[PDB]
Design a protein around this ligand. Structure first.
Ligand code: NAD
Ligand code: NAD
Ligand code: CHV
Ligand code: CHV
Lengths: 277, 287
């Protein structure tokens, strides 16, 4: 049976949740990686039932969450944590680096076969690119782009061949979105290019596929993008996290065995438009 | 329960058959639109059980085919059919094979459908390089391989439900140079990819219908064999050697992607060119 690790979830309002919901329809067991400083809050809400309605799949089943672990996309191995290890919101948690999480999952449940990268972080997102600092820019690339490579590097060892990996990206990488600042656009451009390069390496070496989903806006600026999307997209339906979810589910399955290295647009077709009318 | 019209089947060796086969797996009802030059041959083969192995899905399941209809994408309506064709040895016994007539016929027999597959192409002069292609040959390719999609849409949107879905097939020669892909096929695929976007806007806004195109890798179909002056064997060997995924590309690999795009699982994807080619398109330098 199938296990998917979803790295980067903090609530039920984002892409990771909708991806988890849809995979659950196929009886995929889900492991969530949750950013350590929001990990306890998430567990609290979880235990207090807050996510119960959100976990309902259909008349018969709820989401099968196999586990929830603290996961920090900033840290490749235990050797990379600087005071931080003993910071307020870190010191009651352990084994949350990328390598530690891979070891932990493998120790508890063996090999997995689906991997979802769903994280993005830029401390200076509100600053436009031209006014972004080196530190802010590199922090964005580290958390939002390198973390994909590191994820792949450490998880391939614990995946079955014919496994499949996806990440999330955004069209600001390819066309100008004023407001998507702080190097997030740069991060997405690097993420999309790396998906190809990773596709070559993982494909030839391991028979593992990797693709990325370029999603439309979901409020998880965003008010403008959502308004503009809903007014001008070819399809005028509301974009749902589960719309991204079902596409992810397909890319993560053997149904898409011949697709790799692609950026797939799931955005009601908004990306095809030039001139709004 | 879903009905799909697949335009462009001649045998079991192409993408149309693989798409049919994968749609059947999902209990979609499939109607074949078959070019009249090959229609009788196909039916005879079918009726003599020659396709029986080919219809085997798995150890317990076989394809089920709702209907098989003569179909020629050159002709929009009956008034477009030239006398010579109308009286030709392979067409003269056939009827309701224009784009408009086949749409009417399907509607009359089965009601509204919800899935449409364009899986055809033609170019008289494919063996010539573009620079040496005649005006007539170039326009033949565009008419048959590209405009046909537009017209299929115009007539079928009236026999389709909202939230229905349309796909066609294209090839990466539209975007990057593949020298042997001549006669304006490259041009035709470029137009088809652009038209897919323009059509997605119109169909999405006015009808809530989606359209996408699948850019497939090489497959040794009858029509791919037509290309050599061999072209497809080179294409296939090259793909199997240099693609990220080094496995044989099957028609059913395209078929399960088509099935996904045609289903409501892809409701937020439209206007897109989706590559199903083991990743070959992402390569610059073949190691
Ligand atoms: N929401 C949109 O409008 C939009 C559009 C296109 C693409 N995307 C992409 O979708 C993905 C998910 O975003 P979302 O909108 O679902 O938000 P989300 O909250 O559901 O998920 C993103 C998660 O990343 C987590 N995170 C941040 N730093 C981390 C770290 N270093 N280690 C581990 N986790 C960390 C955050 O806690 C956050 O929960 C992102 O990659 C984003 O770029 C979003
Ligand atoms: N085989 C490949 O390597 C390749 C690669 C990428 C894309 N494609 C595309 O896939 C689609 C199917 O091609 P294939 O390779 O499966 O070849 P094919 O022989 O299976 O399909 C061509 C079919 O279209 C039919 N046809 C041709 N002209 C027609 C017309 N005037 N009206 C009605 N039917 C007509 C032919 O009878 C034939 O059955 C085409 O659009 C092609 O360009 C093929
Ligand atoms: O999850 C996010 O987390 C973030 C964290 C940050 O600090 C800055 C931006 C993001 C963006 C994030 O997602 C986005 C939301 C909306 C759009 Cl249109 C695109 C996105 O990439
Ligand atoms: O369907 C076709 O129909 C044709 C009809 C013609 O008259 C000439 C070429 C084709 C090619 C056709 O399909 C292809 C086959 C192989 C590749 Cl790599 C690309 C293709 O588009």
């Amino acid at each position: 049976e199938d296990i998917c690790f979803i790295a980067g979830i903090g609530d039920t309002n984002g892409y990771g949740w909708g991806i988890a919901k849809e995979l659950s329809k196929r009886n995929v067991k889900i492991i969530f990686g949750i950013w350590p400083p929001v990990y306890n809050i998430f567990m609290k809400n979880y235990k207090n039932g807050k996510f119960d309605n959100d976990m309902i799949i259909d008349k018969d089943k709820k989401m099968n969450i196999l586990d929830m672990l603290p996961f920090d996309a900033s840290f490749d191995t235990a050797n990379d944590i600087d005071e931080t290890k003993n910071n307020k919101r870190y010191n009651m948690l352990q084994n949350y680096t990328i390598e530690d999480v891979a070891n932990l999952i493998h120790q508890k449940y063996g090999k997995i076969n689906m991997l979802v990268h769903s994280l993005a972080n830029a401390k200076e997102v509100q600053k436009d690119l031209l006014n972004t600092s080196r530190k802010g820019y590199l922090d964005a690339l580290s958390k939002s782009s390198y973390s994909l490579i590191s994820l792949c590097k450490y998880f391939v060892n614990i995946m079955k061949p014919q496994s499949s990996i996806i990440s999330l990206t955004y069209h600001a990488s390819q066309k100008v979105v004023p407001g998507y600042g702080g190097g997030m656009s740069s991060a997405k451009a690097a993420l999309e290019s790396d998906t190809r390069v990773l596709a070559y390496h993982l494909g030839r070496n391991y028979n593992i596929r990797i693709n990325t989903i370029s999603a439309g806006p979901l409020k998880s600026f965003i008010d403008y993008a959502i308004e503009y999307s809903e007014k001008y997209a070819p399809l005028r339906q509301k974009l749902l996290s589960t719309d991204i979810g079902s596409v992810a589910s397909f890319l993560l399955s053997r149904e898409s065995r011949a697709i790799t290295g692609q950026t797939i647009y799931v955005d009601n077709g908004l990306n095809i438009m030039f001139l709004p009318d």
